[PDB]
């Protein structure tokens, strides 16, 4: 890794006492709602839950996920076949990779992404092509060749995007979607990000009409209820996709412990306005630091997300000047870590106050 | 891969019974009956509590479980680990297995492992993409390494076992564990033990490969929480070995997962902490069980002497087919898991999950007799 380094350089800086505000992990400080807790917790009093919550024990959990789906995108999907659980989403990513791929195929992400998505595909003996990005944030899709779609069996994408922050319009996944119908490709969408936009609803790919033959989404409790360590997520779409997904996980695990499938249960039933705001303190966050960096990162409009990008004054090599950083007081993940479209960028992670991510500005500034 | 219409066939008929409202004792699915002990859903509940725990339980959160784990192994073995390079945390072994061979691997390399085995190991070799010899089982019931040709030994990277077996509940002592670990190291192989029944011997105690010389640099072993404690649906167990190879699950795992709820780890600490005599306790059941049955099977399956697990490997008469033999059973209200189900050295046998008390086993051990 490059947050190997960044790491160890943090936790030698703290050993030495230097006070150092960590903006280098999207791991939330906002707390999750109680509803979910405390049906995990009357779980534990029912001993029929000590075995394997098998499919059939899962089913309450996608009957609602379910629901919650249609319940904004207006299309239905049928709990028994387009729904399967997940233990966090990164493991479905992964899992699905290899369930609907052959060593040596050839799969389609953005040169900018989660880390493990490159990890993933490396685990499953697949080719890439990086795709280009678009000056406003999102892979460029008019950038793949055209021999480049004729080999290609999958293409991977994630809006709201990690690390970008970037969102899409319907119009980027109709675009997605019909290049994928045009060349019999499989499509993942990975969208754990999706109860944090700043204005307005995330589009799904999956809500597109004839989605349903090649489109799997990949939903989680971790970023939208604040529960990530308590592994659970959703796969969503193509019923022969997700037979094949089912097919891999069942040789591989037996899902969540079934206590934490009900605490799933109650997380998609928690309120609206709790879920929404804790997307408002996020723009809160990205908007007031913005501000105090503009003429100091080129930073994109915030849109929605826990993440900030900002590109590095001309020169400026983002590994070195995170380590310079950090002997500052703020921890960076260096863009550099998102793949090779990420060097010259940082990755701010809002995971803190406002007041501190001011004072946080005030020494990135001093550090230019 | 075996045949998924095998336990497909059982399940309906099962599913049937059921509707029809049949008098149906399933012993074809290894979940015990037994319970936890309370002080590990104590230690859960209690993390429930902690803030701290909601975020990703990263490599240094399962540091306190690890070293019990490596604790736990010494105080078995009398040989020592080292917590921070030498065990990895597992969502369960099954997840452990699987990732370990990718980890250990590329598309196309050689596995080893039984003609008859879990039946996701299979599975798992498949998502690796790899290819595969099944060793023929002996009398005993273990794998027969002297029947693996020199040119498969030569061509092979990975000798896969797990003993006490499932479904075969065959125990190995000392001296196959060294024969196998002499192979794989003269053969420049990993060697994987899954050892989710390590604690259910029923006199005395499971061997590990990992315990012998130079184990330590080949062998990677994987126990579970679920057998020994009876919390399967908590998906915890441990991998321990060697530090290359852990080296390499671990960057596996990585981009896949986040390790399970630290709750879950905490659960795990206390779990190693429960009194050795209530985990005799549980091996004392199956004991009774095995052996109670096993009288009451003598003259209509040839079983292998009971030694250890929930399992009951009882060689059909010459020709019944066991799939056959099983759906007509299920009729007869007897669910038992037809050994074709477990790989090609599975035609023939059924095997008998001991997941019901003794009168219900005697019961089901009648009708074995009277369907024969």
Redesign the interface.
């Known amino acids: 890794s490059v947050f190997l380094v960044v790491d160890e350089a943090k936790r030698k800086a703290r050993e030495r006492g230097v006070g150092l505000i960590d903006l280098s992990i999207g ?2 400080d906002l ?2 709602p109680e509803a979910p ?1 405390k049906a ?2 009357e779980a ?1 009093n029912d ?1 029929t ?5 098998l499919k059939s024990c899962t089913l309450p959990f996608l009957e609602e996920a379910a629901r919650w789906y249609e319940g904004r995108y207006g299309v239905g999907l049928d709990p028994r076949r387009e729904a399967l659980a997940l ?2 989403s ?2 479905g990513l ?2 699905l990779l ?1 369930a609907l791929t ?2 040596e195929d050839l799969l389609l992400l953005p040169e900018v992404a989660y ?2 998505y490159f ?2 595909a ?2 499953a ?1 697949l080719r890439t092509f990086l795709i280009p990005l678009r000056e406003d944030g999102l892979a460029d899709l008019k950038a793949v060749p055209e021999g480049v779609w004729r080999e290609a069996k999958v293409l991977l994408l994630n809006y709201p995007n990690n690390p970008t922050g970037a969102v899409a319009d319907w119009g980027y996944f109709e675009e997605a979607l019909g290049l994928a119908r045009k060349h019999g490709l499989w499509l993942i969408h990975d969208n754990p990000y999706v109860d944090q936009v700043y204005e307005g609803e995330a589009p799904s790919p999956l809500a597109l009409p004839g989605a349903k033959e090649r489109v799997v989404e990949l939903f989680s409790l971790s970023k939208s209820y ?6 659970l997520g959703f796969a969503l779409g193509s019923e022969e996709a997700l037979a094949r997904l089912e097919r ?1 996980k ?5 899902n ?5 499938l009900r605490m799933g249960v109650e997380a998609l039933k928690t309120p609206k306005e709790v879920v929404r705001g804790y997307a408002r303190v996020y723009r809160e966050r990205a908007l007031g630091m913005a501000e105090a960096l503009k003429g100091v990162l080129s930073l994109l409009p915030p849109r929605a997300t826990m993440y900030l990008w900002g590109r590095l004054p001309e020169g400026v090599d983002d590994l070195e000047f995170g380590l310079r950083l950090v002997e500052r007081g703020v921890a960076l993940a260096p863009g550099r870590g998102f793949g090779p479209g990420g060097k010259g960028f940082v990755r701010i992670a809002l995971v803190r106050p406002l007041e501190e991510l001011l004072e946080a500005a005030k020494r990135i500034r001093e550090a230019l």
């Open positions: 791991s939330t707390p999750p807790l995990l917790a534990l001993p839950t000590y075995g394997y919550c233990i966090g990164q493991e992964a899992h290899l052959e060593p880390p493990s990890g993933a490396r685990v003996s604040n529960l990530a360590g308590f592994r891999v069942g040789v591989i695990d037996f969540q412990y079934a206590g934490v």
